[PDB]
Amino acid sequence: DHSELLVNTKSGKVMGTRVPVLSSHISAFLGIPFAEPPVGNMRFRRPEPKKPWSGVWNASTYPNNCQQYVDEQFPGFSGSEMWNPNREMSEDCLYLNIWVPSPRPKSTTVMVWIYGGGFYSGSSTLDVYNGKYLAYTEEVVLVSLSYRVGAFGFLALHGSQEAPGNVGLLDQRMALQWVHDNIQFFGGDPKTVTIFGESAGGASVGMHILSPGSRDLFRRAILQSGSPNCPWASVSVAEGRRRAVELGRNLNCNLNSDEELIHCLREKKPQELIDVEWNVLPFDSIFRFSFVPVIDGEFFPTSLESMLNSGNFKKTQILLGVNKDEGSFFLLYGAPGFSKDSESKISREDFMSGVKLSVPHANDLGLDAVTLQYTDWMDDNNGIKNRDGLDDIVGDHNVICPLMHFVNKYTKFGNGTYLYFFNHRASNLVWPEWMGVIHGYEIEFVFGLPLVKELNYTAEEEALSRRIMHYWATFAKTGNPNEPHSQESKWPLFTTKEQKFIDLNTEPMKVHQRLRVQMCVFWNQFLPKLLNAT
Amino acid sequence: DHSELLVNTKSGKVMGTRVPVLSSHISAFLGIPFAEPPVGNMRFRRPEPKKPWSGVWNASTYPNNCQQYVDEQFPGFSGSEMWNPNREMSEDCLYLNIWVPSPRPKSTTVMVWIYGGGFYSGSSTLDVYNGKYLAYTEEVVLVSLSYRVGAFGFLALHGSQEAPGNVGLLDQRMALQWVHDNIQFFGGDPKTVTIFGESAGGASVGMHILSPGSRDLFRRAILQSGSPNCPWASVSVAEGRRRAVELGRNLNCNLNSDEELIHCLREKKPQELIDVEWNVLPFDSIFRFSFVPVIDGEFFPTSLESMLNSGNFKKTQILLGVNKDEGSFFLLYGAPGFSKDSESKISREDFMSGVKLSVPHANDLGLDAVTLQYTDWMDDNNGIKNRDGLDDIVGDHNVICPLMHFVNKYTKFGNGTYLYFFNHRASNLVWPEWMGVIHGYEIEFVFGLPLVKELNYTAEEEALSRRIMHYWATFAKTGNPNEPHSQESKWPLFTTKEQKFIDLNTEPMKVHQRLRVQMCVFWNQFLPKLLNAT
Numbered sequence A, B: 001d002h003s004e005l006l007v008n009t010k011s012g013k014v015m016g017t018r019v020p021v022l023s024s025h026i027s028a029f030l031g032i033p034f035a036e037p038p039v040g041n042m043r044f045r046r047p048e049p050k051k052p053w054s055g056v057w058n059a060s061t062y063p064n065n066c067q068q069y070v071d072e073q074f075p076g077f078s079g080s081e082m083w084n085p086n087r088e089m090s091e092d093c094l095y096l097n098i099w100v101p102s103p104r105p106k107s108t109t110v111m112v113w114i115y116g117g118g119f120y121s122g123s124s125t126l127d128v129y130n131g132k133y134l135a136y137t138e139e140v141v142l143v144s145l146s147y148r149v150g151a152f153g154f155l156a157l158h159g160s161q162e163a164p165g166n167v168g169l170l171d172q173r174m175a176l177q178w179v180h181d182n183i184q185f186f187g188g189d190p191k192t193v194t195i196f197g198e199s200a201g202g203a204s205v206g207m208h209i210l211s212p213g214s215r216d217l218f219r220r221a222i223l224q225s226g227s228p229n230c231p232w233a234s235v236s237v238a239e240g241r242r243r244a245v246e247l248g249r250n251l252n253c254n255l256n257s258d259e260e261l262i263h264c265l266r267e268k269k270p271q272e273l274i275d276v277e278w279n280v281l282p283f284d285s286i287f288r289f290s291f292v293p294v295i296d297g298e299f300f301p302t303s304l305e306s307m308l309n310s311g312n313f314k315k316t317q318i319l320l321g322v323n324k325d326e327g328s329f330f331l332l333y334g335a336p337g338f339s340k341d342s343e344s345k346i347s348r349e350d351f352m353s354g355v356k357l358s359v360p361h362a363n364d365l366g367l368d369a370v371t372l373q374y375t376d377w378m379d380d381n382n383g384i385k386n387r388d389g390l391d392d393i394v395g396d397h398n399v400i401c402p403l404m405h406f407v408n409k410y411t412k413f414g415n416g417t418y419l420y421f422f423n424h425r426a427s428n429l430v431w432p433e434w435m436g437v438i439h440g441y442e443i444e445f446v447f448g449l450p451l452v453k454e455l456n457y458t459a460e461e462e463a464l465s466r467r468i469m470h471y472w473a474t475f476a477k478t479g480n481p482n483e484p485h486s487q488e489s490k491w492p493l494f495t496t497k498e499q500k501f502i503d504l505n506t507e508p509m510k511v512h513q514r515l516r517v518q519m520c521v522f523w524n525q526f527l528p529k530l531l532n533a534t
Ligand SMILES: c1ccc2c(NCCCCCCCNc3c4c(nc5ccccc35)CCCC4)c3c(nc2c1)CCCC3
Pocket: A068, A069, A071, A079, A080, A083, A116, A117, A118, A120, A122, A198, A199, A274, A275, A276, A277, A278, A329, A333, A438, A439, A440
């Protein structure tokens, strides 16, 4: 061995780079390969482990991002563009990044970040996912992985080994296997790996908790605004096959066999796929994504609900939560009457339109039930109430209530649950006020952006960020976000009986109980019963 | 003619009696016949007009009450016994009573009282229905009528002219015809007759508004805690026939034809019928009564809802309303966990039991919907909340929400609607506090009991009574409860757009809008849709 930036791993040697962070410096190993390029005939296939290399892999720069749909709704607007790929796209995109304190630790807590983006997009290289603040401030080794999205990751033709489904999740698993096998060389402890992620990454985290083939590869878990049972995070194998054939149909493929369909899809340029990906959804919907995880009998041995009910999952500690206005983004992008530069007060007809888009699988009685539950009939033409109503419908149904169902099912068998409600609206938010505390906007706090002066956060936002980062890292280290014997207020354990959680914001800690219970009884128990009966 | 107590009517002469009232005196003509005794072979038959008589009918004393079930739940307790027959019972019971100011007016406003009691009980002669205070204080001629209840009034074998159904309602119509024909001799104006009643009497009032054969016989209407469309106030002709045959079956009757069944029922003593009357209900229920009005194609030409929708009803002014805790009585008598001398905090299981009794025609999804609508899931074991919840369920479903549906349908075609919410709990109430403002407990205020010192009301309750009596009588006189050009606060008109109502209590008037709208959308629109689909 020779110097701090050189690490010899089981796949070969890697040379990283020294990075400044908050007046100090750490090491960064960017763009390390964890799988063979899933290109050509390996499109849609399971990933294969990266063949070891001779020489020194240069890991001074970010890798390519996976091939994906790029948002152009607000060209140049920082609010949207901060989510788009900031590197060239390529199918050659299975890489990971590691930020390591300096001096190199010996055996320290590891955190592995799994990006969101609806299973159709996302990048490990975004500015908001820069691991250097968290690695430096909390003294963790912070890994970000990547995985195939869209059809490249989730095209599913169950029965075929050429496009089985779930390959994106197997990408994530392979990176976790590599971390298990190699992170000791960077000074990480492979026995103390926390996986964490947001939205689709939060669902993904839950999915590794459930999947037998993944559970052993990590210790602990954090789920931010996402749950493995969310209504958008998986499809049946029949629905997967249906969408894959419809994809073929949109590209004039031969549909006579899997073999013909796959061969045709493998010859298309990546953009051809992405150009028609959104055409295969079965309903007029918002918060529904075309190529997502499939309940295949393999990655997931049975239905998610039967797994949760029977305790068929990894038993460990989890820390998880939701933002106050999870719905607002999806409505802005997808529902009539919502706009970025308006207050977006919603008429009764835009309301009813929005209900239908939000619960696309409901029949008419079901839509009446939703409408009744969320309408203030003493004031039914209030545009603000209609707007916020629909924001709650989308948030509750797609994020908060499936998370609460997960949390209640998990807590029965698990070894410690910590639950949060993030309701701080950042002082420098570029999105309009009506959108509130937006899906994804806790991530900048978790990654320490407010510690960076030039980004224009307040001092109280810096404090909030430091507190969150320290909850997250102390939890990853110990299974408990609270500092042993500190003076600070204690985040209590969520238990089956008392169902406690805390808010996360710049005000003194407040403990509450039974997060959105009234609505979640509707979404989790009554409505599914209504739709099954009718 | 000769003196004030002697009146010559079209049926013959009547001698009344002079009655003291509040330091003064008025005349009372008690127990005047309006139909032939509906006895023997006339049991279950339409009423026949009373044959005129020679000589002077002595009308100095109250008539017999109709044959009915007598409440013995709290023997001797004034709260219950004030509702029971206070005269001997007889099938010979079709009489009316008239209270007339002194000196005899010439042509004054007339108010005709139709008692409640679920169509199975009630009496014109109760102390709480004594018309002398209202007649004296407001200078109206106050009539109370009677009508056959239970099977005697409502046994229905559609197709037969021996027991057609609705004969009790035809009793009421015959008394109204007699008033139309004869009240001028008492100094009443037959062109200005208001019919008013409570619970089943309120439903009955609505029924005469709807029925073509009754509409012409009165001018204006007042409905207290009852609506013609209430779920307990009518049955289909198939359900009527079913219950009449089951009545036969309970009495070992021959069931081979209507002719045989009726003949057998006509030989029974009245008590035999009453002893088994409650056995014929199709469900385990509260707020459901065995022999009630039938939707026959004659009294009611079509379904009540089609009548209301098409404007097929008398167009006039109406004044109507509800009490705050309409449910409490039915729960006390009928639901587990409610008792008179306890606070009646209700367990979750007594709650679920009570929901089932309250909505006996719902399937299991429907019961889940009701449960969800009325349960505070942040506090679901609160015994007080469970108690009050069920009190609201019973009240909303059986009284307030059908009244609100009636009020909204009527107001579209009608000529002026005044709506109230009576929420004063009397200072001397003998029932427990949990029961609140009980079904029937506005009646003592409408009839002026609080003006009587010995009855132990407060001075503010006396004021309330006087205000109510004056609303009721000014409305009966003019079609508007408000005094032209007075200084007092104005009860506004309920309109389709603004849906205003007032509270009635001892505090300054408050105007509100959209009475229990949130719950009434559930009962009136969503739940019936849910039960029809499933
Ligand atoms: C986590 C991850 C990402 C986030 C995010 N990204 C921005 C979301 C990008 C919006 C594109 C939707 C159009 N979705 C589409 C797709 C296709 N075709 C389409 C064709 C027509 C219309 C829409 C289409 C094909 C490929 C798949 C997508 C944003 C937010 N939070 C996030 C939190 C908050 C607000 C702004 C955006």
